Structure formats: C-alpha cells, structure tokens
Amino acid sequence: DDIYKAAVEQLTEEQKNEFKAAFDIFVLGAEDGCISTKELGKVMRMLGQNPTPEELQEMIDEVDEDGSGTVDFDEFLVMMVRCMKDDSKGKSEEELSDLFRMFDKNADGYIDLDELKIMLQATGETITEDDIEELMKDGDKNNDGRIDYDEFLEFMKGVE
Amino acid sequence: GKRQTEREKKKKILAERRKVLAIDHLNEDQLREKAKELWQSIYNLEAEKFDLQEKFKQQKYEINVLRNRINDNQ
Amino acid sequence: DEDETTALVCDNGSGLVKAGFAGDDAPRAVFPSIVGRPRHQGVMVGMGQKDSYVGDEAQSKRGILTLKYPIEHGIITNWDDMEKIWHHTFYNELRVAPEEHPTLLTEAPLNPKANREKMTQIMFETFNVPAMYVAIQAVLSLYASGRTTGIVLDSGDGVTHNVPIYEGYALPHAIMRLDLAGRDLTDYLMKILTERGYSFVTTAEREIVRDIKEKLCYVALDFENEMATAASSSSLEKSYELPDGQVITIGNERFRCPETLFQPSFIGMESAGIHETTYNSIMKCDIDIRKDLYANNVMSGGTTMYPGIADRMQKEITALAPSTMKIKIIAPPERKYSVWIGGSILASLSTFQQMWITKQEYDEAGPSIVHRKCF
Amino acid sequence: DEDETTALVCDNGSGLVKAGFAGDDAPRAVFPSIVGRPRHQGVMVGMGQKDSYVGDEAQSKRGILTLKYPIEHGIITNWDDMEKIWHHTFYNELRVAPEEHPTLLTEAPLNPKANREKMTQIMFETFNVPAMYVAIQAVLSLYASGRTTGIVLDSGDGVTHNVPIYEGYALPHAIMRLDLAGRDLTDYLMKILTERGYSFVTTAEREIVRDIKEKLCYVALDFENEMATAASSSSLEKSYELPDGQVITIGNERFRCPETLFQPSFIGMESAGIHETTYNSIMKCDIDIRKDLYANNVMSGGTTMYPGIADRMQKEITALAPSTMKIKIIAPPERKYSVWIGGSILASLSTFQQMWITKQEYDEAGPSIVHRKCF
Ligand SMILES: Nc1ncnc2c1ncn2[C@@H]1O[C@H](COP(=O)(O)OP(=O)(O)O)[C@@H](O)[C@H]1O
Ligand SMILES: Nc1ncnc2c1ncn2[C@@H]1O[C@H](COP(=O)(O)OP(=O)(O)O)[C@@H](O)[C@H]1O
Ligand SMILES: [Mg+2]
Ligand SMILES: [Mg+2]
Numbered sequence: 001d002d003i004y005k006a007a008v009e010q011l012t013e014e015q016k017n018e019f020k021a022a023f024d025i026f027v028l029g030a031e032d033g034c035i036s037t038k039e040l041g042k043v044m045r046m047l048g049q050n051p052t053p054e055e056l057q058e059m060i061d062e063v064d065e066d067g068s069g070t071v072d073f074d075e076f077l078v079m080m081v082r083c084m085k086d087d088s089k090g091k092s093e094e095e096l097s098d099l100f101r102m103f104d105k106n107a108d109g110y111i112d113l114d115e116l117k118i119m120l121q122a123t124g125e126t127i128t129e130d131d132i133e134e135l136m137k138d139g140d141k142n143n144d145g146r147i148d149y150d151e152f153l154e155f156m157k158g159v160e
Numbered sequence: 161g162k163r164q165t166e167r168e169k170k171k172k173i174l175a176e177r178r179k180v181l182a183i184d185h186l187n188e189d190q191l192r193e194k195a196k197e198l199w200q201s202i203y204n205l206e207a208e209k210f211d212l213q214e215k216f217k218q219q220k221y222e223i224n225v226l227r228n229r230i231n232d233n234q
Numbered sequence: 235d236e237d238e239t240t241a242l243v244c245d246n247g248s249g250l251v252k253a254g255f256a257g258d259d260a261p262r263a264v265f266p267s268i269v270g271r272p273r274h275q276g277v278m279v280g281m282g283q284k285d286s287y288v289g290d291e292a293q294s295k296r297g298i299l300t301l302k303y304p305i306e307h308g309i310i311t312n313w314d315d316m317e318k319i320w321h322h323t324f325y326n327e328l329r330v331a332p333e334e335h336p337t338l339l340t341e342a343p344l345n346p347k348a349n350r351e352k353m354t355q356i357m358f359e360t361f362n363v364p365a366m367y368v369a370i371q372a373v374l375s376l377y378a379s380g381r382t383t384g385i386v387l388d389s390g391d392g393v394t395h396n397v398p399i400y401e402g403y404a405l406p407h408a409i410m411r412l413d414l415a416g417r418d419l420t421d422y423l424m425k426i427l428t429e430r431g432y433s434f435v436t437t438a439e440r441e442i443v444r445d446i447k448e449k450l451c452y453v454a455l456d457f458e459n460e461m462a463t464a465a466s467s468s469s470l471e472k473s474y475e476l477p478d479g480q481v482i483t484i485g486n487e488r489f490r491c492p493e494t495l496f497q498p499s500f501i502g503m504e505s506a507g508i509h510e511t512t513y514n515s516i517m518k519c520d521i522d523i524r525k526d527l528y529a530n531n532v533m534s535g536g537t538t539m540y541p542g543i544a545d546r547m548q549k550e551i552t553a554l555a556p557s558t559m560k561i562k563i564i565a566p567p568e569r570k571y572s573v574w575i576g577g578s579i580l581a582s583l584s585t586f587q588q589m590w591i592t593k594q595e596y597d598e599a600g601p602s603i604v605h606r607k608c609f
Numbered sequence: 610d611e612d613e614t615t616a617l618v619c620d621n622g623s624g625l626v627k628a629g630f631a632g633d634d635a636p637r638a639v640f641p642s643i644v645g646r647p648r649h650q651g652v653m654v655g656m657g658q659k660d661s662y663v664g665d666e667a668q669s670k671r672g673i674l675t676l677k678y679p680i681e682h683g684i685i686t687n688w689d690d691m692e693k694i695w696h697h698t699f700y701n702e703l704r705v706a707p708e709e710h711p712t713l714l715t716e717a718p719l720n721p722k723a724n725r726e727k728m729t730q731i732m733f734e735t736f737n738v739p740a741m742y743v744a745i746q747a748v749l750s751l752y753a754s755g756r757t758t759g760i761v762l763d764s765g766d767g768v769t770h771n772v773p774i775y776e777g778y779a780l781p782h783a784i785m786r787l788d789l790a791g792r793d794l795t796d797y798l799m800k801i802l803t804e805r806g807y808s809f810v811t812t813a814e815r816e817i818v819r820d821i822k823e824k825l826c827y828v829a830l831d832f833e834n835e836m837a838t839a840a841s842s843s844s845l846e847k848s849y850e851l852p853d854g855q856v857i858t859i860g861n862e863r864f865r866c867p868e869t870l871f872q873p874s875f876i877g878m879e880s881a882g883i884h885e886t887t888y889n890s891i892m893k894c895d896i897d898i899r900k901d902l903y904a905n906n907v908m909s910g911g912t913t914m915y916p917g918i919a920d921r922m923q924k925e926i927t928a929l930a931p932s933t934m935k936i937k938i939i940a941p942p943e944r945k946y947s948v949w950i951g952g953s954i955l956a957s958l959s960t961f962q963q964m965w966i967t968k969q970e971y972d973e974a975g976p977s978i979v980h981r982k983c984f
Contacts, residue, residue, distance in 0.1 A: 101221055109228040149225055227329050297895045438897050478896050479931035
C-alpha cells in the first residue's frame with residue numbers, strides 16, 4: 001500500500017535506523033524477533049515520551065489490523081511515523097510562505113479553487129471528486145472559500 | 161522641525177557610502193582602471209537594485225498575507 | 235495596489251470618510267467618523283489593550299469605548315486622531331502606500347484657512363504623499379450632478395451648507411452655514427424619547443436612534459394636522475425592533491424630528507427653516523437667474539436617504555416664490571458617495587496633473603503656497 | 610520536586626484548597642477547608658496528642674475533633690490556621706519547598722483589601738517564596754472556559770458571586786456577592802431533616818448531608834406541582850444508605866433544598882433568587898451587549914456537579930428576558946479544578962514573569978506595593 005512508502009518518505013534515515021536498532025533491545029536470542037504488542041510501550045519510554053492509557057490503548061489498536069497479536073516492521077514504521085508529530089525535524093515556514101506565493105497565480109492573497117485544480121492536475125493525476133472534496137475538508141473549517149497561509153501550513157504539516 | 165535632519169542624514173549616508181575621486185590629477189592609466197571600477201560598481205549596484213526591487217515585491221506579498229490575516233480576524 | 239500610479243481619492247465628509255483609488259466608481263473603504271478609546275485602564279493581558287479603535291472595530295466595540303468625535307461641525311480636536319485614522323484607512327483598509335499616489339481630498343464648505351494650513355503641514359511632514367489637491371464638497375456634488383447651474387444643499391453630520399453656483403461659478407457672497415445637522419436631530423429625538431419614557435445618554439443609543447431616523451422617520455406634509463390625526467393612529471403609528479428585542483413604538487415623533495430643521499423655534503434658533511436659508515441665498519444674488527436657481531436646486535448628503543425632503547422643499551419654495559415656473563429637485567440614488575465619484579472625475583482628465591500640489595512647492599513656500607495654489 | 614524552578618499554583622477556593630505545580634493539568638493536593646482540633650485535653654501518651662489536624666487526617670478523625678472553619682464567606686479567623694495548613698500542603702502533601710518556586714494564588718471575589726495586605730505580609734515574613742501573584746477566581750474560570758465574553762457565576766462554599774466580563778474586561782459595577790452557599794444548603798436541609806424526624810447538630814452529619822446533596826438532590830422543574838405529585842411518589846422518592854447502615858428515605862426534599870437559593874423567601878432573604886441577581890447584573894450594564902451575556906453565561910464551582918442548574922437557569926432567564934435569541938449555558942465536566950487549570954495557564958506563557966511580585970519590591974514599599982502591583 002501507499003501508507004508504507006509515505007511513512008518511509010515522511011521520516012528521516014537516522015531516526016528510523018535508531019528506531020530499529022533500538023527495537024532490537026527486546027530480542028535476545030531464540031525468539032521470533034517480533035515482540036508482543038504491550039512491550040512496545042516500554043520502548044517508548046526509551047524514546048523519551050510518557051504516553052497515557054488512552055493514547056496507549058488507541059495506538060495499540062493502530063497495530064495488527066488482521067489480528068495476529070504481533071507487530072511487523074512495516075506496521076512498526078507506520079506506527080512510529082504516526083507517533084511523534086515532529087516530522088522533518090520541524091517543518092519550515094519561510095520558504096513555505098514562498099510556496100504560499102506559489103499556490104496563488106493571480107496575486108490576491110489566498111488560494112482559489114481553480115488554482116488548486118490546475119495545481120493538482122499539473123502533477124499528472126486528473127481531477128476526481130473525493131480528491132478535491134477531502135482536500136477541502138483537510139484544509140478548511142468554516143467554508144471560507146479559500147486556503148490562507150494558516151490553513152496552508154496546517155494542511156501539509158510535516159510534509160516535505 | 162526635522163526639515164534639515166532628514167535631508168542631511170540622507171546626504172551624509174550617501175557621502176559615507178560613495179567615494180570621492182580627485183579626478184583632476186588622475187593620470188591616463190588611472191582614468192582607465194577607475195572608469196572600469198566605477199562601471200563595475202554601477203553594474204553590481206544595478207544587480208542588487210534589481211534584487212531589492214524583486215524582494216520589495218515579495219515583502220509587498222507578505223504585507224498582503226498579513227493584512228488579509230487581519231481582515232479575516234473580525 | 236494597481237500597477238499604475240493613479241491618484242488616491244478620499245472624501246473626509248463631516249460624518250463619513252470614504253476613500254479609494256482614482257478611476258474607481260465607488261470608494262472602497264467607507265467608515266463613520268466615530269473614534270473609540272478604552273473606557274478604563276489596563277490590568278489584563280493576552281489580547282486587546284490597544285488605545286485607538288477606528289472603523290467597524292470600534293462599531294463592534296462601542297460599549298467598551300468612550301466614543302469621541304475628532305471633528306464636530308468642522309472644528310478639529312486632535313490631529314493625532316486623524317493621523318491614526320488615515321494610517322488605518324491607507325494601510326489596514328485601503329492596503330495602499332501614499333508614497334506613490336497623489337491625494338485628492340474634499341473638505342467641508344468654508345473650512346478654516348488656519349485649519350487648512352495646519353492640516354496640510356502636519357500631513358506633508360507626517361506622510362510622504364507626492365502631490366496634493368483639496369476641494370470644496372459643493373463643486374464635487376455639482377460634478378456628480380454634472381450640471382453647472384444650481385444651488386447645493388450639503389447636509390453633513392455637523393453643518394448644513396447652502397451654496398449657489400451659476401454656470402459653474404461659486405457665489406461665496408450667497409453661501410451660508412447652519413449649525414443644524416445629524417447631531418441636532420439625534421439630540422431632539424433623544425429629548426422626545428425621554429418624554430416617551432426612554433432616557434439614554436450614551437452613544438450606542440445615539441447610533442440606535444439615528445438608525446431609527448434612517449428607517450422609520452417621516453417628513454410631515456402638514457404638521458399640526460398630522461399630530462392631530464396621530465393622536466390615536468393605530469395604523470400610522472410605527473414600531474421598531476431594537477437589537478435587544480424590545481419593541482419600541484413611535485408615532486408623530488417620526489415626522490416631528492426632521493421638522494425641527496424646518497421649524498428651528500422648537501429648540502430655539504433665531505434662524506428660520508433651511509428653506510428660508512435657501513430663499514434668502516437666492517435673492518441675495520441678481521434677480522434674473524433666481525428662477526434657474528429655483529429650477530436647478532440640488533440636495534446632497536447621507537441624510538438625503540430619508541423620504542420627504544423633496545416634496546417639502548418644492549411646496550415651501552413655491553409658497554415663498556411665485557408659482558409661474560415649475561420647480562423640480564434632482565437627487566440621484568446613493569448620492570452620499572457622489573462626492574467621491576466627482577473626485578474620480580477630477581482624476582479622469584489629463585489637465586488635473588497640471589495643478590497637483592507637489593512636495594517641492596510646499597518645501598519652498600511652506601504651507602502658505604496653498605493660499606496661492608488652490609485659490 | 611521537578612528539576613526546573615517552575616511556579617506553584619494554588620487555588621485557595623472558599624471550600625476547597627487545590628495546590629500543585631505549574632505546567633500540570635490538575636492540582637496534586639486537593640483537600641476541603643475544614644480544620645479539626647482536639648475536643649479534650651491530654652492525659653494519655655504513646656501516640657497522637659497533636660493539636661492541628663488537617664486534610665484527610667481530620668476527615669478520618671472528624672468524630673474526635675471540634676471541626677472549625679478558618680474561613681467563612683471570606684472572613685478570616687486565625688492566620689495561624691492558614692500557616693499550619695499551608696505548611697502541611699507544601700511539605701507533607703506537595704513535598705515542595707516554597708523557597709525555589711514563585712506562587713500564583715486565587716482569591717475569593719471582592720476579598721477585603723486589608724485582608725490581602727495582612728495575608729501578604731504574614732506570608733512574606735513567615736515564608737520565603739521568591740515571587741507572588743494573586744488573582745480573582747472569576748478571570749481564572751474565564752480562562753478555563755477560554756472565552757473573553759460571559760457572566761461568571763462562582764458558587765463557592767461561603768459566597769455566590771455574579772461577575773460580568775465582556776471581551777476580557779471586568780465589570781465591578783455589575784458584580785454582586787450573595788450570602789447563600791453550601792453552608793445555607795446544609796442548614797436548610799438540616800431543618801427539613803429535623804422535620805423528618807432526624808435532628809443532628811454536629812459537623813459529621815453536616816458532611817453526611819452534603820454528601821446526600823451531592824448524590825440524590827434534584828432541582829425541581831416545577832416546584833409546587835412536584836411536591837403535589839411527591840405526596841406519595843413511591844418511585845420518585847429516593848433513599849440513601851448511611852455509613853452506619855440505616856436507610857434514610859427522602860422525597861420532595863431532594864428538590865426542595867437547592868430551591869432555596871432560587872426562592873430565598875423560604876428562610877428570609879430580601880434578595881430574590883440568584884437568577885434575579887444575574888438578571889439585574891446584566892441590565893446594569895449597557896443594553897446592547899446584554900444579549901451576548903444571555904448567550905455566554907458560565908457557571909463555576911464544586912456545587913455545579915449537581916444536576917438541574919442548567920435547565921432551571923435557561924428557562925427562568927428566558928422567562929425574564931425576551932425569547933428571541935437562544936440562551937445556552939456552558940459548563941465543562943470537573944470544573945471545580947478549572948480555576949487551578951487557569952493558574953497553570955497563567956504560568957504557561959513567558960510574559961507572566963514580567964509581573965511577579967518579588968521579595969525586594971515588598972521590602973521596599975511594604976505590603977502597600979500590591980495596591981499598585983496587582984491593580
Ligand atoms: N444609508 C443611510 N440612510 C440614511 N441616512 C444615512 C445613511 N448613511 C448615512 N446616513 C446619515 O448621514 C450622516 C452623515 O452625513 P455625510 O454623508 O457624512 O455628510 P457629507 O455629505 O457632508 O459627508 C449620518 O449622520 C447618518 O445619519
Ligand atoms: N464531587 C462533588 N460533587 C458535588 N459537589 C461537590 C463535589 N466536590 C465538592 N462539592 C461541593 O462544592 C463545595 C465547595 O465549593 P468550591 O469548589 O470550594 O468553591 P470555589 O469554586 O469557590 O472554590 C462543597 O461545599 C461541596 O458541597
Ligand atoms: Mg453632506
Ligand atoms: Mg466556587
């Protein structure tokens with residue numbers, strides 16, 4: 001699926017290398033190599049965060065969808081990418097404001113829907129309905145008809 | 161009030177920035193090397209004048225950004 | 235900002251400020267001339283704590299601010315207030331820098347010459363406008379009507395001016411200013427509503443009652459007969475829904491409030507009604523053209539949105555003047571913007587930049603140059 | 610103790626003391642404001658024989674101690690009692706030394722200025738807190754709601770305060786204190802239970818009956834009709850299991866006890882119900898914003914855990930005020946901690962240390978400096 005490679009792309013190499021070499025703190029010998037779900041909470045204490053029963057149980061629910069009682073390495077990477085939200089070691093904002101200038105091609109102060117449609121089709125994918133619809137739900141909150149720099153920053157947080 | 165301050169602050173700034181040449185005594189070769197240097201200086205000044213103009217336009221753009229952030233605020 | 239260096243057009247009308255760009259049909263930033271100031275001192279933190287509040291911000295924050303008028307009947311209180319409101323208009327509302335656009339301004343009729351000299355000097359020092367021109371709102375309303383003959387009744391919020399102009403020429407000898415305006419209207423209505431049981435002093439209720447004047451007020455065709463029939467007048471009596479939700483009912487007061495301008499003896503003015511002021515103005519000048527003045531009278535101002543001024547005007551002038559020639563008033567809809575439109579008209583033609591008041595002329599001759607550059 | 614020098618956040622609410630560290634979500638040490646003293650003298654040895662008993666220790670030792678209130682409706686009895694309870698809170702309960710952490714405290718609305726000056730002076734001399742700040746609980750509850758507009762109903766255990774604040778500005782001219790609170794509730798319930806056959810005077814039964822109020826009490830939708838249908842009401846009548854094991858049954862009293870705040874004439878107050886006190890408070894201020902006050906009312910206090918205040922509140926205000934705009938109350942669960950949360954919020958931002966009340970300012974200007982440093 002595309003979530004596995006998106007998690008690959010949204011996380012830096014040093015972080016994931018340390019994550020895996022440090023997950024290898026539970027394995028000791030003559031083991032399957034994949035530790036029980038609950039032990040995952042313990043590696044998190046090593047990470048420096050102090051999560052809570054609500055998030056812990058939810059996050060537990062975020063692994064092992066098919067119901068094997070065990071976690072693989074790709075689910076491991078997607079959950080880790082889904083845990084700390086400080087992606088890209090802090091997404092920038094200045095060049096991003098330049099990119100805000102980029103979304104707009106009529107120099108008005110905001111992003112028109114037509115400008116979004118041309119921007120999206122310039123990638124190579126055409127327009128489908130769920131695309132723009134979901135992109136609007138992600139970007140906007142009150143039907144203001146445009147994407148300003150706050151909604152701009154919010155929508156793509158962590159994305160490189 | 162401030163009538164002379166602004167004018168002579170500007171003239172003072174342009175005096176420290178620019179360099180004055182005792183052109184009358186300048187020798188043949190000296191006119192050569194210096195008019196080359198002056199033309200190159202004007203070249204660089206126009207270069208980052210154009211840079212200033214562009215970046216003026218973008219700072220206008222971020223004014224646009226912030227003023228729209230304000231008008232939405234009501 | 236437009237790519238072209240077109241001029242700024244700003245009408246600082248006595249009661250409303252309407253600003254925009256030249257070549258535009260309507261002003262972009264239009265706000266009332268009220269200014270709000272923090273009623274108390276600062277102890278809280280995290281938001282607000284700003285001194286000057288202008289425009290719709292102050293309109294929303296009317297209750298928390300002492301509402302003050304930087305100008306009343308032309309008199310200037312504090313130039314800093316104009317400085318701040320012009321800053322707000324140019325940058326927060328017009329999103330324009332005055333460095334690259336000359337300004338055409340309109341001033342109240344017969345404004346002080348000392349006022350002009352001080353305002354121009356503070357303007358030129360504080361701001362960096364390239365060029366200047368200021369004109370009387372009378373000729374601006376004339377331009378909006380586009381007819382060189384007529385007498386202009388400018389009904390601002392501080393003064394009402396009657397100015398005759400024949401074939402595009404000003405007649406200062408027959409120009410008069412009357413101290414009756416919106417302020418008086420609100421005051422008189424305040425005292426009548428006090429006699430109706432509702433007694434308020436603060437400015438929020440001032441705006442509420444001027445809104446009532448905008449919506450429900452009549453101009454009585456016959457005064458005492460209409461109060462006589464307004465004794466009961468269940469149908470004729472009219473009600474308003476105040477924003478708090480209470481229903482406030484008013485009857486004869488609807489046409490007893492504007493009547494005071496016509497009948498100043500209600501609250502004690504030696505001057506008679508404004509129709510008398512137009513009448514005297516007319517006869518002061520040569521007899522012959524007076525008929526044309528009768529037939530070419532124009533009325534201008536935000537108040538003109540009310541009904542009843544036209545019929546009353548014509549009937550009383552016909553009563554005073556002989557009824558041979560037919561008198562008819564002209565008043566285009568939304569004429570409170572008309573002055574600003576005329577400003578755009580001034581910037582339309584290519585001769586207007588022959589007499590821009592540039593920076594160097596002011597630097598040479600000081601403010602005094604305007605004494606020779608405008609008139 | 611945290612390695613960082615973060616501030617102390619302590620809500621000395623009139624009825625509960627909730628203390629902890631800044632940056633925390635909930636106070637760590639929360640105890641009622643009762644204080645127990647030895648009912649008799651010392652002859653035994655080997656254990657106990659300690660004067661002051663505070664917190665859960667006194668709760669367990671309620672029977673053996675005379676239970677006294679160091680504060681009632683804001684009035685201060687003995688500063689030594691506060692000294693001891695603060696010692697207990699800081700060292701035995703919070704395990705913190707006040708030397709290295711500035712303290713943010715919350716005080717009951719409209720507390721005496723002399724009370725503030727004496728408490729601050731004894732505090733600074735007795736303790737070694739580096740810096741100080743004290744604030745009214747009204748703005749703290751506002752911060753917990755996170756909305757600058759609204760009227761706060763603070764229902765403590767000694768006083769109920771109604772305070773309007775519009776756009777984060779206090780309105781002392783429309784703030785009132787009512788002497789009805791938990792004490793009154795317990796008293797009235799005591800007399801009704803006396804008329805039910807059970808007559809107790811001591812404080813243990815006071816806590817039992819306030820627990821009954823916490824568990825079983827109703828707020829009657831219609832009063833006399835509900836006693837009329839509560840005549841028999843086998844299903845509607847509700848019982849409680851007292852810790853001794855006896856089953857005590859109460860019917861209409863469940864909704865006849867909180868009703869007294871709404872109907873003070875039951876035990877003789879000139880002031881009408883607290884809804885009238887919110888109503889008058891609202892009209893005292895300008896008319897226009899009153900609608901917003903109607904729509905932005907907030908209620909705070911430990912009592913708010915009871916059901917029925919919201920429906921009664923809205924219905925009666927809609928009965929008193931016009932029903933055009935919709936009135937809705939907001940009350941987050943577990944709002945008795947909310948004030949303390951707001952204290953943490955105050956320590957969250959980096960501007961808060963600009964106005965810490967340091968030791969040297971107090972040493973220079975005495976206690977009087979607070980008169981200029983807080984307000
Ligand atoms: N839409 C409207 N309908 C009726 N009256 C209005 C309206 N807008 C403004 N006014 C009145 O016009 C007055 C302001 O007059 P103004 O137009 O500023 O005079 P001037 O033409 O000298 O600038 C205000 O006091 C207000 O009562
Ligand atoms: N969990 C609870 N449920 C119901 N009522 C409570 C609860 N906890 C405390 N109370 C009531 O709250 C009162 C104390 O109010 P308090 O919260 O101290 O007021 P303030 O908000 O002014 O500090 C006590 O008299 C008690 O009856
Ligand atoms: Mg006018
Ligand atoms: Mg309380």
